[PDB]
Amino acid sequence: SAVTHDYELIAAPVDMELVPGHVTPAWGYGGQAPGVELRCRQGDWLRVRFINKLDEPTTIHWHGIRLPLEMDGVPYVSQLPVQPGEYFDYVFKTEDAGNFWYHPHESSASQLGRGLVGPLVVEEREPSGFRHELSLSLKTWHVDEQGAFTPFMVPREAAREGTRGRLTTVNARPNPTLELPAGQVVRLRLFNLDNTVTYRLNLPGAEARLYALDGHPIEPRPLGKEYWLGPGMRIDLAVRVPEAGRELPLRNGPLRLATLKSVASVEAPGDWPAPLPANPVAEPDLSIAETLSFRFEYKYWQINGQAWDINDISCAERPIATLKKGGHYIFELRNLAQYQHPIHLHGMVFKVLSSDRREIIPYFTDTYLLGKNETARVALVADNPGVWMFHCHVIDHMETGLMAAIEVA
Numbered sequence: 001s002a003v004t005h006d007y008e009l010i011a012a013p014v015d016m017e018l019v020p021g022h023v024t025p026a027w028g029y030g031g032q033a034p035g036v037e038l039r040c041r042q043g044d045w046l047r048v049r050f051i052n053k054l055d056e057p058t059t060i061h062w063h064g065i066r067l068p069l070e071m072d073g074v075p076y077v078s079q080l081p082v083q084p085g086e087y088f089d090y091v092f093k094t095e096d097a098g099n100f101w102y103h104p105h106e107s108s109a110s111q112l113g114r115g116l117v118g119p120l121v122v123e124e125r126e127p128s129g130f131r132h133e134l135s136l137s138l139k140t141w142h143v144d145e146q147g148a149f150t151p152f153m154v155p156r157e158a159a160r161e162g163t164r165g166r167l168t169t170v171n172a173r174p175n176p177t178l179e180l181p182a183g184q185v186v187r188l189r190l191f192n193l194d195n196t197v198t199y200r201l202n203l204p205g206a207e208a209r210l211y212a213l214d215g216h217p218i219e220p221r222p223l224g225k226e227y228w229l230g231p232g233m234r235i236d237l238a239v240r241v242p243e244a245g246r247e248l249p250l251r252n253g254p255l256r257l258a259t260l261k262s263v264a265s266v267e268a269p270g271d272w273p274a275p276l277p278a279n280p281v282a283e284p285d286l287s288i289a290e291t292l293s294f295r296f297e298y299k300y301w302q303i304n305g306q307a308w309d310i311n312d313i314s315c316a317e318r319p320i321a322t323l324k325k326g327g328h329y330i331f332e333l334r335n336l337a338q339y340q341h342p343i344h345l346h347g348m349v350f351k352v353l354s355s356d357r358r359e360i361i362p363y364f365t366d367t368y369l370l371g372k373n374e375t376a377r378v379a380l381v382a383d384n385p386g387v388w389m390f391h392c393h394v395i396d397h398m399e400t401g402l403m404a405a406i407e408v409a
């Protein structure tokens with residue numbers, strides 16, 4: 001009748017030698033940054049005793065999980081900030097398998113910037129045919145050449161593509177070599193845990209197939225040339241590991257993020273897995289849907305429908321829209337700028353229909369990377385009652401105005 005995955009998760013200072021010979025005074029979940037991997041299994045309860053051992057308030061928002069509003073981790077909408085030395089018990093069922101993540105939703109640029117980000121895997125209820133998996137958490141740290149943090153908001157940058165760090169890491173390490181077994185198909189779980197970077201992921205040489213995007217399965221498709229992994233996006237990238245001693249570079253454009261060294265296995269080469277089964281998300285019914293149009297765009301640099309978010313007041317009470325529970329809606333997402341925005345909706349999963357620019361194979365996701373001057377159409381069932389944040393996931397833009405709240409009732 002119930003399975004529960006218990007975790008005690010502590011946010012606390014972590015000193016990290018990101019730049020050899022230098023201390024970076026980071027903040028981490030479970031003694032590391034990126035934070036410890038949380039695992040659950042689809043259909044089961046995830047129970048996390050979150051304990052704040054930072055010197056300021058924080059919450060944990062569970063990016064991509066359709067959970068009840070009480071557990072969304074948004075200060076003053078979900079809960080009260082968790083104060084230093086206090087705890088909060090996040091309990092919710094994970095009905096969607098795949099790759100999610102977690103991070104604060106309080107002092108976000110700073111707290112995410114300093115390390116408060118982690119991967120969450122919801123295992124499929126039935127065994128995927130994957131024999132091997134590897135989790136890759138990308139983060140581009142705003143630290144200078146001596147390990148010190150640079151500002152997480154720099155206005156000139158917040159009005160552009162966002163405040164970009166300098167030091168790219170995969171699982172806290174600049175450009176690691178990850179060993180994988182030869183001949184085998186490996187599910188690489190790729191998490192962009194960065195505040196601002198879009199990694200133009202490419203893996204030259206290897207046969208690589210996309211199996212899921214932002215925690216939701218697709219008809220598997222070759223990687224091809226590149227995949228633009230925006231902040232807070234994830235993919236499962238199944239890779240045929242080449243014969244032993246080969247070394248493939250996972251890249252952000254021409255830059256190596258990581259190297260995948262094919263190691264000798266005695267295991268038989270296994271076949272490509274079947275498509276991951278769809279998560280139980282409410283099919284939007286286009287013929288019955290109603291459209292809402294949204295216009296994008298140390299103070300207000302970005303606007304939603306002419307409304308800046310003030311990340312300093314409790315203005316989640318004047319919601320940009322009010323959806324009926326069980327209602328089917330189309331969101332037209334209009335980027336009225338030369339700046340891309342990874343636009344994210346809490347609480348709910350939307351299906352990407354079409355774009356101005358891109359040809360779309362329709363898929364479900366909590367985030368759409370909204371290109372420069374792009375108009376994309378996106379559809380959802382207003383499944384989950386509450387007040388859900390709707391924002392660009394470049395943490396700078398979210399903090400300098402690019403956020404709104406959508407009330408489901």
Ligand SMILES: [Cu+2]
Binds near residue numbers: 061063064345346347
């Ligand atoms: Cu979210």
Ligand SMILES: [Cu+2]
Binds near residue numbers: 342392393397398402
């Ligand atoms: Cu943005």
